[PDB]
Design an enzyme around this catalytic site. Structure first.
Site, PDB file in Angstrom:
ATOM      1  N   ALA A 295       0.786  -1.155   0.000  1.00 19.40           N
ATOM      2  CA  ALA A 295       0.000   0.000   0.000  1.00 19.40           C
ATOM      3  C   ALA A 295       0.878   1.291   0.000  1.00 19.40           C
ATOM      4  CB  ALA A 295      -1.016  -0.008   1.162  1.00 19.40           C
TER       5      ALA A 295
ATOM      6  N   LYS B  68      -4.254   2.486  -2.885  1.00 13.01           N
ATOM      7  CA  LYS B  68      -3.674   3.413  -1.953  1.00 13.01           C
ATOM      8  C   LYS B  68      -4.584   3.621  -0.783  1.00 13.01           C
ATOM      9  CE  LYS B  68      -1.670   6.862   0.127  1.00 13.01           C
ATOM     10  NZ  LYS B  68      -0.355   6.769   0.836  1.00 13.01           N
ATOM     11  N   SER B  69      -3.984   3.616   0.411  1.00 17.80           N
ATOM     12  CA  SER B  69      -4.756   3.876   1.628  1.00 17.80           C
ATOM     13  C   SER B  69      -5.541   5.187   1.451  1.00 17.80           C
ATOM     14  CB  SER B  69      -3.902   3.983   2.879  1.00 17.80           C
ATOM     15  OG  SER B  69      -3.327   2.742   3.275  1.00 17.80           O
TER      16      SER B  69
ATOM     17  N   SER C 123       7.509  10.878   4.230  1.00 15.47           N
ATOM     18  CA  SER C 123       6.389  11.380   5.029  1.00 15.47           C
ATOM     19  C   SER C 123       5.391  11.979   4.050  1.00 15.47           C
ATOM     20  CB  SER C 123       6.852  12.405   6.011  1.00 15.47           C
ATOM     21  OG  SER C 123       5.713  12.932   6.675  1.00 15.47           O
TER      22      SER C 123
ATOM     23  N   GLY D  78       2.226  11.940   3.859  1.00 17.47           N
ATOM     24  CA  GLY D  78       1.058  12.538   4.422  1.00 17.47           C
ATOM     25  C   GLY D  78      -0.310  12.104   3.860  1.00 17.47           C
TER      26      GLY D  78
ATOM     27  N   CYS E  24      -1.097   4.386  11.785  1.00 17.59           N
ATOM     28  CA  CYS E  24      -1.770   5.561  11.314  1.00 17.59           C
ATOM     29  C   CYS E  24      -1.965   6.539  12.486  1.00 17.59           C
ATOM     30  CB  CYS E  24      -3.176   5.154  10.807  1.00 17.59           C
ATOM     31  SG  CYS E  24      -4.106   6.554  10.109  1.00 17.59           S
TER      32      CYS E  24
ATOM     33  N   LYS F 243      -3.117  -3.809   8.613  1.00 17.43           N
ATOM     34  CA  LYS F 243      -1.689  -3.461   8.401  1.00 17.43           C
ATOM     35  C   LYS F 243      -1.100  -2.913   9.709  1.00 17.43           C
ATOM     36  CE  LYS F 243       1.865  -2.071   5.458  1.00 17.43           C
ATOM     37  NZ  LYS F 243       1.347  -1.257   4.298  1.00 17.43           N
TER      38      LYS F 243
ATOM     39  N   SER G  84       6.103   0.922   7.550  1.00 11.04           N
ATOM     40  CA  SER G  84       7.483   1.409   7.715  1.00 11.04           C
ATOM     41  C   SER G  84       7.957   1.486   9.136  1.00 11.04           C
ATOM     42  CB  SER G  84       7.655   2.775   7.051  1.00 11.04           C
ATOM     43  OG  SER G  84       6.500   3.475   7.116  1.00 11.04           O
TER      44      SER G  84
ATOM     45  N   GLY H  34      11.471  -4.701   3.086  1.00  7.27           N
ATOM     46  CA  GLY H  34      12.761  -5.146   2.523  1.00  7.27           C
ATOM     47  C   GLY H  34      12.806  -6.241   1.470  1.00  7.27           C
TER      48      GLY H  34
ATOM     49  N   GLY I 108       7.163  -2.716  -1.523  1.00  3.13           N
ATOM     50  CA  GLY I 108       7.116  -1.263  -1.479  1.00  3.13           C
ATOM     51  C   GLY I 108       8.347  -0.677  -2.158  1.00  3.13           C
TER      52      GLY I 108
HETATM   53  C1  LIG Z   1       5.937   6.282  -0.661  1.00  7.58           C
HETATM   54  C2  LIG Z   1       5.324   5.276   0.279  1.00  7.58           C
HETATM   55  C3  LIG Z   1       3.976   5.381   0.550  1.00  7.58           C
HETATM   56  C4  LIG Z   1       3.361   4.527   1.443  1.00  7.58           C
HETATM   57  N1  LIG Z   1       2.039   4.688   1.704  1.00  7.58           N
HETATM   58  C5  LIG Z   1       1.405   3.808   2.510  1.00  7.58           C
HETATM   59  C6  LIG Z   1      -0.013   3.844   2.755  1.00  7.58           C
HETATM   60  O1  LIG Z   1      -0.704   4.728   2.207  1.00  7.58           O
HETATM   61  N2  LIG Z   1      -0.535   2.907   3.578  1.00  7.58           N
HETATM   62  C7  LIG Z   1       0.179   1.918   4.136  1.00  7.58           C
HETATM   63  O2  LIG Z   1      -0.361   1.035   4.828  1.00  7.58           O
HETATM   64  N3  LIG Z   1       1.493   1.857   3.989  1.00  7.58           N
HETATM   65  C8  LIG Z   1       2.128   2.704   3.149  1.00  7.58           C
HETATM   66  N4  LIG Z   1       3.521   2.558   2.953  1.00  7.58           N
HETATM   67  C9  LIG Z   1       4.169   1.470   3.646  1.00  7.58           C
HETATM   68  C10 LIG Z   1       4.581   0.376   2.687  1.00  7.58           C
HETATM   69  O3  LIG Z   1       3.311  -0.134   2.297  1.00  7.58           O
HETATM   70  C11 LIG Z   1       5.468  -0.630   3.437  1.00  7.58           C
HETATM   71  O4  LIG Z   1       4.757  -1.124   4.570  1.00  7.58           O
HETATM   72  C12 LIG Z   1       6.845  -0.086   3.872  1.00  7.58           C
HETATM   73  O5  LIG Z   1       7.365   0.790   2.831  1.00  7.58           O
HETATM   74  C13 LIG Z   1       7.774  -1.303   4.036  1.00  7.58           C
HETATM   75  O6  LIG Z   1       7.918  -2.037   2.794  1.00  7.58           O
HETATM   76  P1  LIG Z   1       9.275  -1.908   1.887  1.00  7.58           P
HETATM   77  O7  LIG Z   1      10.415  -2.211   2.799  1.00  7.58           O
HETATM   78  O8  LIG Z   1       9.017  -2.873   0.793  1.00  7.58           O
HETATM   79  O9  LIG Z   1       9.249  -0.461   1.423  1.00  7.58           O
HETATM   80  C14 LIG Z   1       4.162   3.430   2.064  1.00  7.58           C
HETATM   81  C15 LIG Z   1       5.513   3.323   1.776  1.00  7.58           C
HETATM   82  C16 LIG Z   1       6.122   4.189   0.911  1.00  7.58           C
HETATM   83  C17 LIG Z   1       7.605   4.024   0.642  1.00  7.58           C
HETATM   84  C1  LIG Z   2       2.184   7.181  11.619  1.00  8.28           C
HETATM   85  O1  LIG Z   2       2.810   6.596  10.494  1.00  8.28           O
HETATM   86  C2  LIG Z   2       3.086   7.462   9.390  1.00  8.28           C
HETATM   87  O2  LIG Z   2       2.086   7.214   8.388  1.00  8.28           O
HETATM   88  C3  LIG Z   2       1.264   8.291   8.181  1.00  8.28           C
HETATM   89  C4  LIG Z   2       1.665   9.598   8.501  1.00  8.28           C
HETATM   90  C5  LIG Z   2       0.829  10.680   8.298  1.00  8.28           C
HETATM   91  C6  LIG Z   2       1.270  11.966   8.630  1.00  8.28           C
HETATM   92  C7  LIG Z   2       0.418  13.054   8.434  1.00  8.28           C
HETATM   93  C8  LIG Z   2      -0.853  12.812   7.916  1.00  8.28           C
HETATM   94  C9  LIG Z   2      -1.294  11.523   7.592  1.00  8.28           C
HETATM   95  C10 LIG Z   2      -0.437  10.451   7.782  1.00  8.28           C
HETATM   96  C11 LIG Z   2      -0.835   9.150   7.443  1.00  8.28           C
HETATM   97  C12 LIG Z   2      -0.006   8.040   7.632  1.00  8.28           C
HETATM   98  C13 LIG Z   2      -0.430   6.722   7.243  1.00  8.28           C
HETATM   99  C14 LIG Z   2      -0.047   6.599   5.714  1.00  8.28           C
HETATM  100  C15 LIG Z   2       1.231   6.090   5.546  1.00  8.28           C
HETATM  101  C16 LIG Z   2       2.210   6.863   4.911  1.00  8.28           C
HETATM  102  C17 LIG Z   2       1.946   8.176   4.446  1.00  8.28           C
HETATM  103  O3  LIG Z   2       1.003   8.402   3.671  1.00  8.28           O
HETATM  104  O4  LIG Z   2       2.702   9.090   4.823  1.00  8.28           O
HETATM  105  N1  LIG Z   2       3.572   6.399   4.757  1.00  8.28           N
HETATM  106  C18 LIG Z   2       3.934   5.138   5.198  1.00  8.28           C
HETATM  107  O5  LIG Z   2       5.100   4.717   5.149  1.00  8.28           O
HETATM  108  N2  LIG Z   2       2.948   4.411   5.824  1.00  8.28           N
HETATM  109  C19 LIG Z   2       1.642   4.823   6.002  1.00  8.28           C
HETATM  110  O6  LIG Z   2       0.896   4.002   6.551  1.00  8.28           O
END
Ligand SMILES: Cc1cc2nc3c(=O)[nH]c(=O)nc-3n(C[C@H](O)[C@H](O)[C@H](O)COP(=O)(O)O)c2cc1C
Ligand SMILES: COCOc1cc2ccccc2cc1CCc1c(C(=O)O)[nH]c(=O)[nH]c1=O
Ligand SMILES: Cc1cc2nc3c(=O)[nH]c(=O)nc-3n(C[C@H](O)[C@H](O)[C@H](O)COP(=O)(O)O)c2cc1C
Ligand SMILES: COCOc1cc2ccccc2cc1CCc1c(C(=O)O)[nH]c(=O)[nH]c1=O
Lengths: 313, 313
Positions: free
Chosen positions: A20, A44-45, A69, A71, A131, A165, A196, A251, A272
């Site tokens: 996601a 996408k979330s 970050s 957002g 979140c 998640k 993350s 990873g 990811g």
């Molecule tokens: C740019 C970016 C956006 C992400 N957005 C979300 C999100 O919207 N919701 C979510 O559950 N995780 C999100 N993640 C978390 C990834 O889904 C994943 O849990 C994390 O990056 C670890 O996987 P990786 O080591 O393969 O990157 C995001 C990660 C990245 C790098």
């Molecule tokens: C608390 O974990 C960070 O993930 C978020 C940070 C935010 C900061 C400001 C506003 C909204 C936010 C939403 C999330 C959740 C979305 C998300 C994001 C993201 O959209 O920044 N990045 C990730 O690596 N994992 C996630 O799950």
């Protein structure tokens, strides 16, 4: 020799899918993941209203991984519902829809409306617990009473099987507590480990500067930095939640990395950072790589080694 | 140009030292660190009675870092005290002593006995808060009421300036909470960020086995996996604790890595994994490389850039 899986009443050509947030935001992205040789995809979330997200630069990647970050930028729930209900070709592969509401009320509102489409089309809910909730409180899944509240209300409001998640945890008493909470909820049929690694800080030596703009440069870590942490969470929950599935995430760059996830107990394996960086051709490479490993070892299916990581004497 | 500095009323030739636990357990180790080019040394975390530690293999290293569940093997507190009191040459460099009792009562009994030697000889206390207390519950630094109790009792029993070794945190609300606890204690003059990243799991693909024997292969991570997490913790505490020093620990293999820790706010820089792997010659390389980065930038002193990491807009 085959990578096929059947679970949650769906059939998957292989265990790979995007994580996601990566290549899942727009209709273009979702078609691209659908065209890939991934075994599934997740959208996408989302939040109830569309979001621009944080100011840029907000993602950066490097040899050992990524920091972000973002957002929660997204097209809004109505968009992803529509994709699920009217645009997605389920004959291609199954679809997970991630939701990431900013309060428990927002999540309830979205899942009540997801329910009839999930029942009718077979879209699978992944609820993001890693979140924010109230600023100055920990994220939801680091606040066990808020996590219980969220799973209670969403179970009630949704009434169907879904998944969650999870953030990484680093303490055995937190594994013990978090899995106990999850095990309270029969409808939680899968657990994705991990989101993350929170609030890392990358500094560029030459410019003497952080690399992302929001949060004074603090953001979540993904990629090669987090594999051992992702493997530990996958196995921790696999061992504590025998009645649930565990999806692995963190990873994965190689079929060998996917192999380790699956030995730790992963059923699906999400990608990811590596997918962001390399693009969706990665899925053919990963499938070939894992099959080559399986062939060397004489394994013909995933279930022959899933969860079978050995420990020492 | 020389990297000399003064703090906690002691003089240091440079800001480098071993991390607790590495090359510091026996008299031989300690003498070897003393003969090194390091600015300081810290002894192995100790308990009142000597400990064999956990079953071997208990430490393993790889290109991106290390995992360990050593289990606090040490010669016991009487030994380290006697090293501090009778054996160490303080003309060579300062000495820190790490205390890691398994209860608050254990730590109070050890610091009461340490205080007169601290007074007399100038040995510096580093209290390890990244330590279990009771099975079933989180390590002390992840239980802020227990952390407050340890700091209250220790400050009362010791009554001189000391420091604390912290686990990484991953959530901003947790930084805010932990730093506010530490700031309640005027005697805590330094904070060391960070201890190993807890409960990772390394799996070997060939053997399909975890790589350390204890805890089903679960252990703390150090090395390159942890550098951005260590930078974030150094900076977060540096920003929150303006009246304390912050010591950086985590992922230092190079003078560039040490440069980033100092930009993040570090006064002293500890070397664990890299030191375990390279041996004590590493201190000469690190000094030279840091001096070289300083020269290229036109920095004459550490103070000109400590904590001066730039944010964006
Ligand atoms: C740019 C970016 C956006 C992400 N957005 C979300 C999100 O919207 N919701 C979510 O559950 N995780 C999100 N993640 C978390 C990834 O889904 C994943 O849990 C994390 O990056 C670890 O996987 P990786 O080591 O393969 O990157 C995001 C990660 C990245 C790098
Ligand atoms: C608390 O974990 C960070 O993930 C978020 C940070 C935010 C900061 C400001 C506003 C909204 C936010 C939403 C999330 C959740 C979305 C998300 C994001 C993201 O959209 O920044 N990045 C990730 O690596 N994992 C996630 O799950
Ligand atoms: C083999 C081993 C033993 C250790 N023992 C201790 C210890 O007794 N007390 C302590 O505070 N930290 C201990 N640590 C943690 C290190 O001091 C350090 O915080 C961690 O390794 C991160 O630094 P690095 O990335 O440079 O390895 C130990 C680390 C290792 C690898
Ligand atoms: C809190 O977990 C990491 O540190 C420890 C784990 C232990 C496990 C079983 C018995 C005693 C333990 C003691 C500690 C504290 C000592 C320590 C150790 C260690 O001696 O295992 N390793 C580290 O990476 N950091 C430490 O701070």
């Amino acid at each position: 020799m085959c990578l096929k899986l059947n679970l949650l009443d769906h059939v998957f050509a292989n265990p790979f899918m995007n994580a996601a947030g990566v290549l899942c935001s727009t209709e273009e992205d979702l078609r691209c993941m659908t065209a890939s040789s991934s075994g599934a995809l997740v959208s996408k979330s989302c939040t109830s209203a569309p979001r621009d997200g944080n100011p840029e630069p907000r993602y950066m990647a490097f040899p050992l991984g990524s920091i972000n970050s973002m957002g929660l930028p997204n097209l809004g729930f109505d968009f992803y519902l529509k994709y699920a209900s009217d645009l997605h070709d389920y004959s291609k592969k199954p679809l997970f829809l991630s939701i990431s509401g900013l309060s428990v009320e927002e999540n309830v509102a979205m899942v009540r409306r997801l329910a009839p489409v999930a029942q009718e089309k077979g879209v699978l809910l992944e609820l993001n617990l890693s979140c924010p909730n109230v600023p100055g409180k920990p994220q939801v899944a680091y606040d066990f009473e808020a996590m219980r509240t969220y799973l209670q209300q969403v179970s009630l409001a949704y009434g169907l099987p879904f998944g969650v998640k999870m953030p990484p945890y680093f303490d055995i008493a937190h594994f013990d507590t978090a899995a106990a909470v999850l095990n309270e909820f029969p409808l939680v049929k899968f657990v994705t480990c991990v989101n993350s690694v929170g609030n890392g800080l990358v500094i560029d030596a030459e410019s003497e500067s952080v690399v992302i703009k929001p949060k004074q440069g603090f953001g979540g870590l993904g990629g090669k930095y987090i594999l051992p942490t992702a493997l530990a969470n996958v196995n921790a929950f696999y061992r504590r939640c025998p009645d649930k599935l565990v999806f692995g995430c963190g990873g994965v760059y190689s079929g060998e990395d996917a192999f380790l996830h699956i030995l730790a107990g992963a059923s699906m394996v999400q990608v990811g950072t590596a997918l962001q960086e390399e693009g969706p051709g990665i899925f053919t490479r990963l499938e070939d790589e894992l099959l080559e490993i399986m062939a060397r070892k004489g394994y013909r299916t995933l279930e022959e080694f899933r969860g079978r990581v050995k420990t020492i004497e």
